[PDB]
Amino acid sequence: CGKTMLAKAVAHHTTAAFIRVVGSEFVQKYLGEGPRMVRDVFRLAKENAPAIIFIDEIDAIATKRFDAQT
Amino acid sequence: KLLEHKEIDGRLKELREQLKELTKQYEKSENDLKALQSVGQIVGEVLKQLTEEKFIVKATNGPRYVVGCRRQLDKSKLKPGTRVALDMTTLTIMRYLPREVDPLVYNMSHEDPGNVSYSEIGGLSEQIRELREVIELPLTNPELFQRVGIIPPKGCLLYGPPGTGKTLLARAVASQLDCNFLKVVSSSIVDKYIGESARLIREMFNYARDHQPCIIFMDEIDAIGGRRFSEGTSADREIQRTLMELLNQMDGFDTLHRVKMIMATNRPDTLDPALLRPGRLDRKIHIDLPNEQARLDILKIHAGPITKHGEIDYEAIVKLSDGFNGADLRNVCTEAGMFAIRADHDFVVQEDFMKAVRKVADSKKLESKLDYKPV
Amino acid sequence: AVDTAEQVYISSLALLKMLKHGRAGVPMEVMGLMLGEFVDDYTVRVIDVFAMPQSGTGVSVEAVDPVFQAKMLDMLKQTGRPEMVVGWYHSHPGFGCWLSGVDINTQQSFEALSERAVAVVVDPIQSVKGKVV
Amino acid sequence: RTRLLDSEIKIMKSEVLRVTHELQAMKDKIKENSEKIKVNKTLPYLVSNVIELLDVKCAVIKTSTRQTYFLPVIGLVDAEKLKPGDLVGVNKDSYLILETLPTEYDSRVKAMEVDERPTEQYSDIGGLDKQIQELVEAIVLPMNHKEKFENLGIQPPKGVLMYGPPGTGKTLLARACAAQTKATFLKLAGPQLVQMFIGDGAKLVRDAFALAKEKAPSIIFIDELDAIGTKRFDSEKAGDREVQRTMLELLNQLDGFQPNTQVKVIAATNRVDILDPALLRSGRLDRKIEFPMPNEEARARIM
Ligand SMILES: Nc1ncnc2c1ncn2[C@@H]1O[C@H](COP(=O)(O)OP(=O)(O)OP(O)(O)=S)[C@@H](O)[C@H]1O
Ligand SMILES: Nc1ncnc2c1ncn2[C@@H]1O[C@H](COP(=O)(O)OP(=O)(O)OP(O)(O)=S)[C@@H](O)[C@H]1O
Ligand SMILES: Nc1ncnc2c1ncn2[C@@H]1O[C@H](COP(=O)(O)OP(=O)(O)OP(O)(O)=S)[C@@H](O)[C@H]1O
Ligand SMILES: [Zn+2]
């Protein structure tokens, strides 16, 4: 239904800083680097400008069922 | 009486040739003796440049660091995303390197075995033609597509009954163009780790980005695909994140170029609707069971190098054939040879064929519900 | 062992040659020879420093080319001051400057030529403005 | 009187070079062997995997601790014997390649090897002679007389399935062909391919096939294939997945892409209708072999 097509146009017409983020990029091999990458994105966001973050497909992140064993 | 010259020179010649062949061992092993003192060096990537001398890298196994360079490195070559070689103790930069290859890629880049040309398969020639124009043209000549002014399709989907010749068709294509057939089995991707499969996808698509005319083929998608869940088993999470890695890096912001993606499975009913949107997988190409002419074709393909005698009613064999695969007829030819091995008939009589067809059509009392049309 | 008073003199050019040549080849330990005059039992006076050429691309490995010795000392004979070699140097650039196994290895072979040929270590990293070191 | 003494003393002038070559052999051999004693007697070899091979003659290593290492100097192995993904013996401190290790094989795969060699000759099975004929003529003769096929020139058949009621005896033929055929008979229980960690059953299937390939006359037996052979389904909220992934790995490493001629597969289920049609299709498991109940005389034969 044209989901990313509008974020593309917003990235085109804007003047602000625009950071694309792969959804599953945070979960990585080494321990704890995920929350550190969250810190990284948000520190740079606080740094740059009035800016725009687009995170694609947070279904990789926001899953309402967990298992604190694995 | 003057054979002393050749005797002394034979002494010198045997001594010279044996000195070469016995001191070249000392030479190469002394090169090894000098080489035994080299030190392994840490592999890492550069985050960014702090100052003219201060550099900030990340070790791939773990932590971050703040390092320095040599004096002959041409520091403008250090850019965010490069890969460097770090000292073990001094922990400074030694050398900028090209990107690594992740040998899983190498085991499906060059490992690919070729096959016979597209005349080996048969009876589905329209699909062969169609797949050829969607793949071979927009990398050999895309400007004809540009004259219309429409982007060629990105990926193509194969589907059908089991063993109608999908994988064999991909092998024919991989014998035809011979450029960059990255054939993924789509099942030995996931290993046991957290972001491992994602990192494999990143490596694959960046390697696809590098060697610009690439072909991706993933047989048996249903391992990696799934549909969706209410988060039943914790292992399914990682598959869904891997599939969203695929969904992102086939559409994304940085759009692809020339990476044609061939996709084949048995039943596309179990596939994710987010993958079956057009644009990621443009055309659903159907490969169905062969027709009477097509069964005749495949039978006259596999009966090529078979020593027979001329009483072969191919019409009766195809007429008694109904709802068969290509491998069904291959099994017919195999078991006809098996009946020929019975009672030591070195040739193949026509009586072998009817019995083999009866055995094969007898054995198919087991498999029903063979149709799974997508959406 | 039997010791004496411990004292090493310098030349002002020495320290500068030390820092420059130990900086220009920093991540690998750079060999260099040291030149001066054994005045007495307990003081040693380095007056000149020339650096050694480098070789294959590996940490701490060292060599003394004798034709380089002959030609360098020959040039210093036709230079105003010829004098006796007094030792050598290199760096331990990333650490607290102790002589390594290769260092003591070249020391037990180099000590048979001179008694008090003193091994010296410059470090252009752990010194900022108020350290030599 | 002048030349012969000149050559007899030139044998000594060239014995100067012969003693020089003996020195360059022996005395340099002492020093080179001394150094390779000082390196190779460091008996702990950290094993690793070669990631790629640069040429600006330069190899890249990931150790088993998962630390990526560069080295410009390869060491005591040759660039022909290297390919990306090889086990090599590496010194701990120097990080220098020393030896070349054979394979990456699991201990469970080694445990699957048949070494007891049971005894059950074909006279122990009564009343099933036609199926014994079909099995032997399907499997034992591709192991023995390959030229007899290619003179006729077709294909050897790919795998044989047993099925039937649960007491007709299907383990019997497996132990029989173990007792008779001297190939690498390889057993495999059904649920042993089921794993807890996601992605090890595929590794297990592939290691099993690899250890079969490197012991080329290779007879792989599967018992209760329906443990991993399950008819797939598209539902929501729930569903077994990983077992189908192992099943697809079994399929593809069996048949489809990259075919093979050195594998022999024997499967046996109690029930048939469980399985996906792709498991059987007609070239994964070639000869469908039914087992009936013993009719009249066969029961007397068995008793
Ligand atoms: N106005 C439009 N309406 C629909 N499709 C359009 C439109 N303009 C362009 N398109 C094309 O159709 C695509 C729309 O799909 P997307 O923008 O990719 O949405 P989406 O990212 O596929 O959402 P998903 O499938 O849930 S990830 C565009 O990328 C264009 O190729
Ligand atoms: N048109 C054909 N011409 C020749 N051989 C064919 C043909 N179709 C199928 N075969 C045979 O059947 C097998 C090829 O089927 P594949 O291409 O592997 O399909 P597939 O991999 O079985 O896909 P599945 O069954 O959905 S996993 C080989 O044994 C071929 O010899
Ligand atoms: N000729 C024979 N026919 C049938 N059964 C026999 C014969 N000879 C021996 N047996 C018995 O058959 C038994 C083996 O039966 P099973 O192997 O358990 O049945 P099955 O074929 O394995 O079915 P499963 O358990 O589902 S694999 C042995 O313990 C023998 O006592
Ligand atoms: Zn040192």
**What's B245-268 look like in SS3?**
HHHHHHHCCCCCCCCEEEEEECCH
Instruction: Indicate left, alpha or beta for A12 from its phi (over 0: left) and psi (-120 to 50: alpha).
Output: alpha
Q: Assess contact for D146 and D264: CB atoms under 8 A.
A: no
Q: Assess contact for B12 and B20: CB atoms under 8 A.
A: no
Taking CA atoms only, the protein residue closest to ligand 2 atom 19 is B163
Instruction: Give strand ranges (E) for A11-70.
Output: 17-21, 51-55
Q: Which residues of B touch D149 (CB under 8 A)?
A: 337, 341
* Strands ordered across the beta sheet of B260-265: B181-184, B215-218, B260-265, B155-159, B283-286
Instruction: Give CA–CA dist D149/B334, Å, rounded.
Output: 10
Instruction: Give CA–CA dist D294/C3, Å, rounded.
Output: 103
Place of tokens 């037996």: D221
| Mutation choice for B interface testing from A19, A21, A29, A65 by most B CBs within 10 A | A29
Peptide bond preceding C133: is omega within 30 degrees of 0, i.e. cis?
A: yes
Instruction: Give CA–CA dist B217/B174, Å, rounded.
Output: 10
Instruction: Give strand ranges (E) for chain D.
Output: 46-54, 58-63, 68-71, 88-90, 97-100, 160-163, 184-186, 218-223, 263-269, 287-290
How distant, in Å, are the alpha carbons of A25, A27, B200, B246, B272 from that of A37?
9, 9, 19, 21, 29
Residue C47's nearest CA partner among C74, C12, C4, C99 is C12
Place of tokens 């519900």: B369
Determine phi and psi for D218, rounding to 5 degrees: -130, 110
Residue D84's nearest CA partner among D109, D48, D117, D129 is D48
Count CB-CB contacts under 10 A for residue C127.
12
Q: Which two tokens stand for residue D231?
A: 């008819």
Check CB contact of A40 with chain B, cutoff 8 Å: no
Determine phi and psi for D37, rounding to 5 degrees: -70, -40
**Chain D, nearest residue to B305 by Cα:** D153
Instruction: Give CA–CA dist D17/D165, Å, rounded.
Output: 84
Q: Is C21 assigned to a binding site?
A: no
Question: What is the distance in A from the centroid of ligand 4 to the CA of B69?
Answer: 19
Distance from CA of B35 to the nearest CA of C (A): 9
Q: Which two tokens stand for residue C99?
A: 């002589």
Taking CA atoms only, the protein residue closest to ligand 3 atom 16 is D169
Q: Which residues of C touch B86 (CB under 8 A)?
A: none
What is the helix (H) or strand (E) element at residue B158, kind and residue range?
A: strand B155-159
Alpha-helical (H) ranges within chain B are: 4-35, 125-135, 137-140, 143-148, 166-176, 196-210, 235-251, 292-302, 314-320, 326-341, 350-363
Q: Which two tokens stand for residue D218?
A: 């290779």
Give the three-class secondary structure for D224: coil
Give the three-class secondary structure for C84: strand
Please count the CA atoms within 13 angstroms of the CA of C120 that sit on its side-chain side.
28
Q: Is A4 assigned to a binding site?
A: yes
Residue D77's nearest CA partner among D99, D59, D44, D94 is D99
Taking CA atoms only, the protein residue closest to ligand 3 atom 23 is D166
Determine phi and psi for C91, rounding to 5 degrees: -115, 160
Residue B329's nearest CA partner among D258, D229, D281, C45 is D281
Check CB contact of B333 with chain D, cutoff 8 Å: yes
Give C8's strand partners.
Answer: C44
Count CB-CB contacts under 10 A for residue C67.
7
Burial of D191 (0-12, 13-18, 19+ CB in 10 A): exposed
Q: Which two tokens stand for residue B186?
A: 């789509």
Q: How far is CA D296 from the centre of its chain?
A: 44
Instruction: Give CA–CA dist B249/D154, Å, rounded.
Output: 45
Give the three-class secondary structure for D5: helix
Question: What is the distance in A from the centroid of ligand 3 to the CA of D138?
Answer: 21
Enter the DSSP assignment of B360.
H
Instruction: Give CA–CA dist B28/D93, Å, rounded.
Output: 24
Q: Assess contact for B330 and B290: CB atoms under 8 A.
A: no
Check CB contact of B344 with chain D, cutoff 8 Å: no
Chains B and A touch (3+ CB pairs under 8 A): yes
Whether residue B252 has its Cβ less than 6 Å from ligand 1: no
List Cβ neighbours of D257 (8 Å cut-off, separation of 6 or more).
Answer: B167, B170, B171, B183, B185, B219
Instruction: Give CA–CA dist C69/C9, Å, rounded.
Output: 23
Enter the DSSP assignment of A62.
-
Taking CB atoms and an 8 Å limit, are B12 and D273 in contact across chains? no
Instruction: Indicate left, alpha or beta for D98 from its phi (over 0: left) and psi (-120 to 50: alpha).
Output: alpha
**Chain D, nearest residue to B191 by Cα:** D199
Give D75's strand partners.
Answer: D97
List Cβ neighbours of B249 (8 Å cut-off, separation of 6 or more).
Answer: A22, B201, B202, B205
Taking CA atoms only, the protein residue closest to ligand 2 atom 20 is B163
Instruction: Give CA–CA dist B136/B141, Å, rounded.
Output: 8
List Cβ neighbours of D287 (8 Å cut-off, separation of 6 or more).
Answer: B335, D134, D138, D157, D159, D160, D161
CA angle (C64 as vertex; C58, C65 as ends), nearest 5: 105
Instruction: Give CA–CA dist B129/B291, Å, rounded.
Output: 18
Taking CB atoms and an 8 Å limit, are B244 and A60 in contact across chains? yes
Check CB contact of B21 with chain D, cutoff 8 Å: no
How distant, in Å, are the alpha carbons of A3, B118, B355, D182 from that of B304?
54, 16, 19, 35
How distant, in Å, are the alpha carbons of A36, B306, B341, C67, D202 from that of D145?
64, 18, 12, 74, 33
Instruction: Give CA–CA dist B90/C93, Å, rounded.
Output: 7
Instruction: Give CA–CA dist D249/D255, Å, rounded.
Output: 10
Instruction: Give CA–CA dist D68/D105, Å, rounded.
Output: 22
Amino acid letter for position D66: R
Q: Assess contact for B193 and A29: CB atoms under 8 A.
A: yes
Count CB-CB contacts under 10 A for residue B97.
18
Taking CB atoms and an 8 Å limit, are A27 and B196 in contact across chains? no
Q: Which two tokens stand for residue D294?
A: 């013993």
**Ligand number, closest to the Cα atom of D120:** 3
Give D267's strand partners.
Answer: D161, D222
CA angle (D71 as vertex; D65, D74 as ends), nearest 5: 105
Q: Assess contact for B4 and D6: CB atoms under 8 A.
A: yes
Strand bridging mode D184-186 / D88-90: unpaired
Q: How far is CA D138 from the centre of its chain?
A: 22
Residue D285's nearest CA partner among D299, D300, D273, D268 is D268
Count CB-CB contacts under 10 A for residue B107.
14
The rounded radius of gyration (Å) of the Cα atoms in chain B is 30
Instruction: Determine the number of helices (DSSP H) and then strands (DSSP E) in chain B.
Output: 11, 10
Count CB-CB contacts under 10 A for residue B141.
10
Instruction: Give CA–CA dist A41/A61, Å, rounded.
Output: 15
Residue D189's nearest CA partner among D163, D224, D159, D219 is D224
